[PDB]
Design a protein around this ligand. Structure first.
Ligand SMILES: [Ca+2]
Length: 314
DNA sequence: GGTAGACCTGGACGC
DNA sequence: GCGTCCAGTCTACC
């Protein structure tokens, strides 16, 4: 009863609602779609993970987003805490307004968007986002998810335990910069990315001015931010774009990887024109990015997630 | 300046 | 069952 991951049906009094139609958000299309790797559908339609240094379980009905927090007496989330959820899902942005625009200037988007509504972008923490995506290169969502889980378990603060799952906060720069972290991460199966994580943690703390440097990027321009990030080991143009888009508030950033290349070729008959190559390359990847920005506008980064999510779900 | 290759790991086909 | 195939970044070299 008071044990294990909660359910809306089982512990009614412990849940609070946030007005939010499914047309505005579909958890099943957002949480497991490569934006964040920290959410699990422990119970059907119920997703749990760490949000703002606390464990939460989220589920939804047609017009409501139901939320519960595990912090000492078990109680429903408070207005303040719920606001933490609204910020995480950037709920002040109306997705229906964005879908309408993208759909009006892109017939193919409109076709796809009819079936995959509610795909929005999570507003993530810089550190978590940086190191999660450093772990993403040349990898698949399933493996990435495990690596990040092992990373947090070995170097992140212990939060609370539900059933046999112990939740951990995301590691700090100091922890990741610690001695012999690479060796350890390597034993956890991060492969060559083990060094990238270690090397990047130290680079930020010992050469860029630390956390302040990363966080300051949220006020910088996309061009600036993307440039700064490419400095770090393991961070190329794709990883830099994912970070800008999902954690540094650069909605025009368009991450280009295998999926967006397939989409561009299959659904837009796209081809590099000013580029020198016919396939993926630093110059062509950049061009593809500009193509989507020119097509969808300032929020091209958000539009991209809709087709990406629909691509995965197929 | 703009390429070819190597690269951790493990679920996938291919045969 | 074994080998190859895949899900970006970095570097040696033209
Ligand atoms: Ca690939």
């Amino acid at each position: 009863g008071s044990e294990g991951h909660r359910t809306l049906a089982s512990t009614p009094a412990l849940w609070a609602s946030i007005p939010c139609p499914r047309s505005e958000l579909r958890l099943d299309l957002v949480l497991p779609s490569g934006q964040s790797f920290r959410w699990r559908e422990q119970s059907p339609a119920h997703w749990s993970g760490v949000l703002a240094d606390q464990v939460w379980t989220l589920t939804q009905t047609e017009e409501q987003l139901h939320c519960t927090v595990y912090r000492s007496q078990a109680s429903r989330p408070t207005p303040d805490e719920l606001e933490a959820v609204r910020k995480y899902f950037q709920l002040d942005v109306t997705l229906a307004q964005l879908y309408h625009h993208w759909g009006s200037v892109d017939s193919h988007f409109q076709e796809v968007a009819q079936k995959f509504q509610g795909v929005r972008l999570l507003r993530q923490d810089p550190i978590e986002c940086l190191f999660s995506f450093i772990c993403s290169s040349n990898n698949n969502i399933a493996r990435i998810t495990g690596m990040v889980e092992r990373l947090c378990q070995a170097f992140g603060p212990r939060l609370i335990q539900l059933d046999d799952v112990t939740y951990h906060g995301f590691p700090s720069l100091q922890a990741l910069a610690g001695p012999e972290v690479e060796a350890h991460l390597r034993k956890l199966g991060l492969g060559y990315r083990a060094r990238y994580v270690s090397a990047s943690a130290r680079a930020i703390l010992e050469e860029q001015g630390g956390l302040a440097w990363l966080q300051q990027l949220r006020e910088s321009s996309y061009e600036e931010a993307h440039k700064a990030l490419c400095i770090l080991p393991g961070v190329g143009t794709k990883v830099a774009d994912c970070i800008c888009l999902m954690a540094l508030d650069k909605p025009q950033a368009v991450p280009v990887q295998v999926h967006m290349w397939h989409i561009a070729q299959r659904d837009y008959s796209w081809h590099p024109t000013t580029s020198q190559a016919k396939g993926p390359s630093p110059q062509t990847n950049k061009e593809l990015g500009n193509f989507f920005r020119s097509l969808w506008g300032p929020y091209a980064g958000w539009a991209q997630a809709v087709l990406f999510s629909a691509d995965l779900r197929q």
